[PDB]
Amino acid sequence: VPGPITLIEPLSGNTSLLIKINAIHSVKKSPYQEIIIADTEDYGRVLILDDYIQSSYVDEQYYHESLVHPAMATHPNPRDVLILGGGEGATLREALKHGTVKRAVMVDIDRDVVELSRAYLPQMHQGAFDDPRAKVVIQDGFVYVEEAIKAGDKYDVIIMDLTDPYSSDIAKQLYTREFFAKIRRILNDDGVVVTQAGNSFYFPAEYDMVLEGVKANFPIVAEYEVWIPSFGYAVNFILGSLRYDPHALTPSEVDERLRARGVKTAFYTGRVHLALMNMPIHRKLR
Amino acid sequence: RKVPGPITLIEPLSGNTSLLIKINAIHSVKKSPYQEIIIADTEDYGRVLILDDYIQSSYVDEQYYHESLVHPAMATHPNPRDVLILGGGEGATLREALKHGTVKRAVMVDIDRDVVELSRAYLPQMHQGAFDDPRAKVVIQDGFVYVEEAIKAGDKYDVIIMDLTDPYSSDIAKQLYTREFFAKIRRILNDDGVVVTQAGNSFYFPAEYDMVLEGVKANFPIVAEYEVWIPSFGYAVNFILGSLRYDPHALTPSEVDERLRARGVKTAFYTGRVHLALMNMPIHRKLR
Amino acid sequence: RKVPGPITLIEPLSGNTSLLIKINAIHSVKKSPYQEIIIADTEDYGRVLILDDYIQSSYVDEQYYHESLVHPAMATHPNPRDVLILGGGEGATLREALKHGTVKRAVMVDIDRDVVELSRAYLPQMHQGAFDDPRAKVVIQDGFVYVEEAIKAGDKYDVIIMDLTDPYSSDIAKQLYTREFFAKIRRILNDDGVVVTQAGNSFYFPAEYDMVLEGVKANFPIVAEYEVWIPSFGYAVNFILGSLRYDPHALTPSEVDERLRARGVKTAFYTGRVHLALMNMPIHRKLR
Amino acid sequence: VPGPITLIEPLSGNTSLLIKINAIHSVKKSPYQEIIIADTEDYGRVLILDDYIQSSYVDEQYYHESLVHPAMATHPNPRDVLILGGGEGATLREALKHGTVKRAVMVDIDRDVVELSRAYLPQMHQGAFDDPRAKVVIQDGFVYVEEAIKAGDKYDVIIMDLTDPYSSDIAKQLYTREFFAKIRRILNDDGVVVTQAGNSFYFPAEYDMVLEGVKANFPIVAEYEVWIPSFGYAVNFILGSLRYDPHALTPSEVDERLRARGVKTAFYTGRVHLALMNMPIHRKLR
Ligand SMILES: CSC[C@H]1O[C@@H](n2cnc3c(N)ncnc32)[C@H](O)[C@@H]1O
Ligand SMILES: CSC[C@H]1O[C@@H](n2cnc3c(N)ncnc32)[C@H](O)[C@@H]1O
Ligand SMILES: CSC[C@H]1O[C@@H](n2cnc3c(N)ncnc32)[C@H](O)[C@@H]1O
Ligand SMILES: CSC[C@H]1O[C@@H](n2cnc3c(N)ncnc32)[C@H](O)[C@@H]1O
Ligand SMILES: N=C(N)NCCCCNCCCN
Ligand SMILES: N=C(N)NCCCCNCCCN
Ligand SMILES: N=C(N)NCCCCNCCCN
Ligand SMILES: N=C(N)NCCCCNCCCN
Known part of the structure; x- marks a missing residue:
């Protein structure tokens, strides 16, 4: 006990x-x-x-690989990646594994999280913070995206790795219908966004709000979940795409892209992708 | 509330x-x-x-558990007519198995009459009448003794479903999880029979999971492992399906859907696409 | 079990x-x-x-609480004939007060009819029939309104016992713990009357305790403070006894025992020696 | 929460x-x-x-003053004190406050407790370990007492500050009828022993065992309790005496002895002593 x-x-x-x-x-x-x-x-x-x-040492790879690789593998050529959140650096670590990536920006609001991760969670970042392809920006992701729209910046893949939409005051503006309209403005024509969306079983209303926000703004939307023991539930992910359909990938095409890009994983493979694309998300049944 | x-x-x-x-x-x-x-x-x-x-078992999520335990095995078998369930005291496993129109006879064996009777009284949405279906027979007995008696009598089943208390915590069920028990199970199957059991959780209890897996693999040439998150349990339950002839990996979504339709099976969860996902998702293990 | x-x-x-x-x-x-x-x-x-x-209140320790709340006050008063209890919804305070043979009239006022009724039905060892004693009257009303109405009617009591929900947590009871409320209590006491209240806990809630104490002291020339450990609550409940004439500190163990005997009071805990200990034990405060 | x-x-x-x-x-x-x-x-x-x-910073004085001062004040002239247990050093600290004490021995089985206290609990020992009157011995108190009997050592006051009689395997032999017979052999003819005895409310059987042990061996036995918030209950103490009755000591004599001996306390006074001597211990009443 x-x-x-x-x-x-x-x-x-x-x-x-x-x-x-x-x-x-x-x-x-x-x-x-x-x-x-x-x-x-x-x-x-x-x-x-x-x-x-x-994030935990024993199961964080389930979370970070599930957040990052379906989106990155769906995109035929992700060169510019933006990550909102991801303060421990594991999301950045996974995205940098794609050999196609030339520039990865990670924006977290909280310098203390980044610094404590640097010091105490080496198995999370594994040096990702100092990769020459990476840039770490301390700023509210909401301000960063407003500034990106002003500058006309564009990304191939945007990954949102924030605190939960059902609990987090600091992240709340990044989960709105309006925010997803802004995200679309800083994507290339064929870009993809992916976000964790809490949990549809315990927090269906907040999940549904995120989903409706993505669907209002992206013609292709995939929903998938993965059990993360340390969280107590299956995290829900929502992938929004402007052109490329993650459902259209075979296991063999996923494996081919991972191989060509030199991506090694502990979990994600083409067969995992197929399962993620076919498994309905959990809801309370009565 | 935090607490x-x-x-x-x-x-x-x-x-x-x-x-x-x-x-x-x-x-x-x-x-x-x-x-x-x-x-x-x-x-x-x-x-x-x-x-x-x-x-x-819980009202809001038991269908995830019972549909996952029962339907992959039953759908894999082209014609399950005789079904044995060990455990399954609330009657939901029996309920799922009886939905297959091919089933002519289903036996459920639980060691504990108090569980069956409290279910009868308090859990109507679990059994949904399954205990009194004319195809069904409820036997109160240690499943170990029942199987030894079945071997003596030369009884044979198409599908055996083990719905017991966990292999990592349960003294009463522990003999039913052994290599020797699975050799007994094989003796009461038809030559094309299938067994399925829940096997605890490979993430939190890898050693006990591995013991059950080793036991199934010793006795069955086809073994499929799959898991489903059951919120009320706090984890993804691991299932192990052992088969003598038919491979659950060979079934397409549309073959699964076709067999469910033909057999009149309605579900809240399991479909051909769920089958495909179960067959392709590796089980969770501690990664560090 | 650790948990x-x-x-x-x-x-x-x-x-x-x-x-x-x-x-x-x-x-x-x-x-x-x-x-x-x-x-x-x-x-x-x-x-x-x-x-x-x-x-x-709990079956195994409620007598520690109720006897401590009631008997020091009642024993201090040489002749308590009219008793008012605010709160005391399970009826055990009323039970203890009625044991004094001098009592001719006891009114119990609780704001919550559901507490009284559920106690009637499910806590018989608490009230032990006290609710139906011919000397007793049970009134369902906010104690604040009851006391305002008592002042208007010119009603007077010998002993007022406040057995309310805690001053540190309870919105419904909060107005009954103020300096102004204790001034109202004094207006419905006889010239030699006594009040007693529980006042939460001075160790964990010193500010709220201090507020109740200063409210009693503003209104009563004699104030005694005492505490008793109630296992089921997790702490020593603090009591504050306010008196207009008779000093609980002046009572010898022998005089306490004699009054209890003369009045036919039987107790599981309170005696003259307990009274002496209650009067001499300082209350707990955080020491660092 | x-x-x-x-x-x-x-x-x-x-x-x-x-x-x-x-x-x-x-x-x-x-x-x-x-x-x-x-x-x-x-x-x-x-x-x-x-x-x-x-032991906790905010309430340990309630425990240690209650354990030590009734016994020490009852003895008209405690010169030699033995403490069994008391690893954080607070019992030793309280006993050393008595100016009459010439020698105080503390015997704890566990060097790690004494050393961690030295390092992390300065407000507990307050220097007591290094007082010239004090000797710290690392040893099972059972063995120490057997050795004291063989050597013919004698004490005025023996204080037992051990882990609980209802839970502790390491302390179990020190709570027996036979152990108290040994304790009596290392006391002066007017000596006193005091021990904590768990809790009579939650652990009546184990309390009754310790009480019967003391009563078998000492003609005067006083029982008292004090609520220690951090423990969740009123600790029971049992004081055994060969000559002097703690019941006979008045508030004013307690205050006088504390003054004469230079003892300063946050809690214990003559009136507290009176209350401790008159308050019956808690038991489950139904
Ligand atoms: C640990 S992964 C979640 C991260 O999201 C970051 N976060 C929360 N809200 C915002 C925001 N509005 N903009 C950028 N990062 C955020 C938190 O600081 C945390 O490190
Ligand atoms: C509620 S589903 C689990 C069921 O397995 C039952 N069970 C446990 N061990 C055995 C056994 N050896 N034989 C049959 N049923 C069992 C328990 O009584 C429970 O009803
Ligand atoms: C069970 S003892 C505590 C009792 O105090 C009663 N109580 C709380 N607030 C008030 C109030 N303002 N007036 C009368 N009774 C009250 C509560 O209903 C409870 O039954
Ligand atoms: C912290 S006070 C309780 C102390 O009693 C000590 N103790 C427990 N059992 C024995 C024993 N048999 N002999 C001496 N000290 C002991 C423990 O090491 C602890 O430091
Ligand atoms: N226990 C929970 N409810 N956890 C939610 C955490 C998910 C937010 N991203 C953080 C992971 C960083 N890579
Ligand atoms: N909380 C848990 N760990 N539960 C274990 C699951 C129970 C396995 N058979 C019972 C399922 C009901 N037919
Ligand atoms: N913190 C606590 N558990 N407090 C409950 C205190 C009891 C106050 N009403 C009187 C009790 C019933 N007569
Ligand atoms: N159940 C409990 N929390 N009890 C702890 C009692 C402490 C016993 N001797 C050590 C006291 C410190 N000198």
Whole structure:
């Protein structure tokens, strides 16, 4: 049974996880959120923001590979990548594996998250922050995108790796119908966006809001989920595309693109892509 | 609420992780000779059956579990006529299996009459009448003894479904998860039979999962592994399907849909596309 | 068990400390217009009344609370004939006060009819029939309004006992803990009357305790403070006794015992020596 | 509500405390027990052994003053003091305050507890370990007492500050009828012993065992309790005496002896002594 020291991770308000803690590496009240870096018995080292595990050593690859590779593999030639959020650097790490990428920008609002990850979560970033193709910008992603529209900047793939749409005050403006209209303005004609969208089982209304926002703005929309043990649920992802349909990829085409681009993964393959494209998302059935 | 409450179920998960689940009502607590049984209403999952602290089934998500346990195996078999279920005390596994119009006879064997009776009384949306279907027979007995008696009598089944308490926590079910038990199961199958069992969770209990897998593989030439997230359990349940002839990997979505239609099977979840996803999604393991 | 369960009450204590208490059964849940009410069986404390997540009373330790609230005040008064109780919805305060043979009239005023009725039905060992004693009258009303009406009518009492929800957590009771309310209480006491109230807990809620104390002291020339550990609450409840004439500190153990004997009062806990200890034990405060 | 990081402190098996934690300073698996030093929001810094708070900054004085001063004040002239347990050094600190004390020996089985206290709990020991009157011995108190009998050592006051009689395997032999017969052999003819005895409300059987042990061996026995918020209950103490009755000591004589001996306290006074001597201990009443 978990203890003596335990993290109470909120899930739905009516369910939480109790997770044994072995050590606390750092506690920082930043201007934006409470940050803890801790060792858990089940999941190894974790980043926690306002009580929610954002990433764990033992299962973060399931999350980051699922967030990044379906979108990147769908795009025939992703050269410019924008990541909103992704403060521990693992999203950036996965995107940089695509040999086609020439420029990857990561924008997180919270310098303290980036710095504590640099120091305490080396297996997350694995040096991604210092890749010559990468640029790390500390700024509200909302301001960054408004500035990108003014400058006429364009991206092939935009990946949103933010705090949850059902809980997070700092991320709330980035999940609106209006924000997705802005995202479309900073994509190339054939660009793709992907975002995590919370959980459709526990937070259907907030999930549906994100979905309706993507659908209003993108003609091709794919929905898929993956169980992340440390979060207590299957994270929902929503992929919006302007031209290329992730459903049209065979396993063999996915594997071919990963091979050609030199991408090694612990999880994502062509067969995983096929399963993600065929598995309906969970909803409360009664 | 950060801490669900004021009344809460602490559901064990790994020993290092548990779920805290708000409870609205407790309908029955019964210490049976075999296990502690609670029937309760939860805010998130509706009514649940709990055995020794583990939710076995919830109103809002049980169809994910029971449809995943039953339909891949039944759809793989071109003509399942005789079905044996070990466990499945709330009656939902029986309910799913009986939907296959090809089934002529279904036997369900549970060790614990108190579970069956509390289900009869408190869980109508689980059994949905399945206990009293003229095709069905409910036998109260240790599934180990039942199978030994079946071998002696020369009984044979097309599909055997094991819906037991977990291999990592359950003393009463532990003998049914052995290499030797699966050799007995094979003795009560037809030459083209299929078995399916839940096998706990490969992420949190890899050693116990691996033991069950090794046991199935020792005894069956075709073995498919798949998992489905069951919110009320806190994890993706692992299933292992063992087959003597027919490969579930060979079925297209449209063949699955065709067989379900022909057999009159209606589901809330399982379809041909779900089948394809189950067959292609690798199971979760701790990666570091 | 390190984590009590499987079904558990999370009882708030300070906001930074809570109690986890194993539950065996839930007898009743009622969302009343005033508060959420649960009657439940706990393993450690037997049956409990819970209001908004806080145990108000338990079978195994309620006598510590009710005897401590009632007897020091009643024993201090040489001849309590008329008693008013504000709160005390389970009826145990009324039960203790009625034990004094001198009492001719006892009024109990609770704002929440659902608490009184559920206690009547599910907590018989609390009221023990007190609600139907010919000396008693049960009035359903906000104690604030009742006292305003008592002042208008010129009603007078010997002993007023306040058995309310906590001053640190309870919106419904908050107006009854003010300096102005205690001035009203004094207006419905005889010239030699006494009031007693529980005042939360000075260790975890010192500011709210201090506010109640300063309110009593503004209005009464004699003020005694005492506390008693109530296991089911997780802390030592603080009581504040305000008196117009008679000093509880002046009472010898022998005089307490003699008054209890003469009045036919039998107790499980309170005696003259307990009174001496209550009068000499300082209340707990955080020391660093 | 407590969290996100929480200590689950066991109480009865059917009740536990959930306590918010702010920091973890040290975790050490010693040969004898698991040790944690942590900061709690409600109780400040704590020493935890096998999941039970042994001492907290904000309330430890209630425990240590209650354990030590009734016994020491009852003895008209305590010169030699033996403490079994008391690894954080607070019991030693309280006993040394008595100006009459010439020699105070503290025997704890677990060097790691003493060393972590030295490092992390300065407000507990307050220098007591290095007082010239004090001697710290690392040893099982059972063996130490057997050796004291062989050497013919004698003490005025023996204070037992061990882990609980209802939970602790390492301390179990020190709570027996036979152990108290040994304790009597290393007391002067007017000596006194005092021990904590768990809790009579939640653990009546184990309390009754300790009481029967003391009563078998000492003609005067006083029982008293004090609520220690951080433990979740009123600790029971049992004081055994060969000559002097703590019941006979008046508030004014207690105050006089404390003054004469230069003892300053945050809690214990003559009136507290009177209350402790008159308050019956808690039991389940139904
Ligand atoms: C750890 S992955 C989630 C990240 O999203 C970042 N985040 C939250 N809201 C915003 C925002 N409005 N703009 C950019 N990053 C954000 C958080 O600082 C966190 O590091
Ligand atoms: C509720 S689904 C799990 C069911 O498996 C049942 N079960 C556990 N062990 C055995 C066994 N050895 N034989 C038959 N049923 C069992 C339990 O009684 C439960 O009803
Ligand atoms: C169970 S003892 C506490 C009781 O105080 C009662 N109470 C709380 N606030 C008030 C109030 N303003 N007037 C009268 N009774 C009250 C509550 O209904 C509860 O039954
Ligand atoms: C912190 S106070 C309790 C102390 O009692 C000590 N203790 C427990 N059992 C024994 C024993 N058998 N002999 C000496 N000390 C002990 C523990 O190491 C702890 O430091
Ligand atoms: N426990 C939860 N509810 N977690 C939600 C975390 C997902 C937000 N991205 C963070 C992952 C960073 N790569
Ligand atoms: N909470 C859990 N770990 N549950 C284990 C799942 C129960 C397996 N058979 C019962 C399913 C009902 N037919
Ligand atoms: N924190 C707590 N658990 N407090 C409950 C205190 C009881 C106040 N009403 C009186 C109790 C019923 N007579
Ligand atoms: N259940 C509990 N929390 N009990 C801890 C009691 C501490 C016993 N001796 C150590 C006291 C510190 N000197």
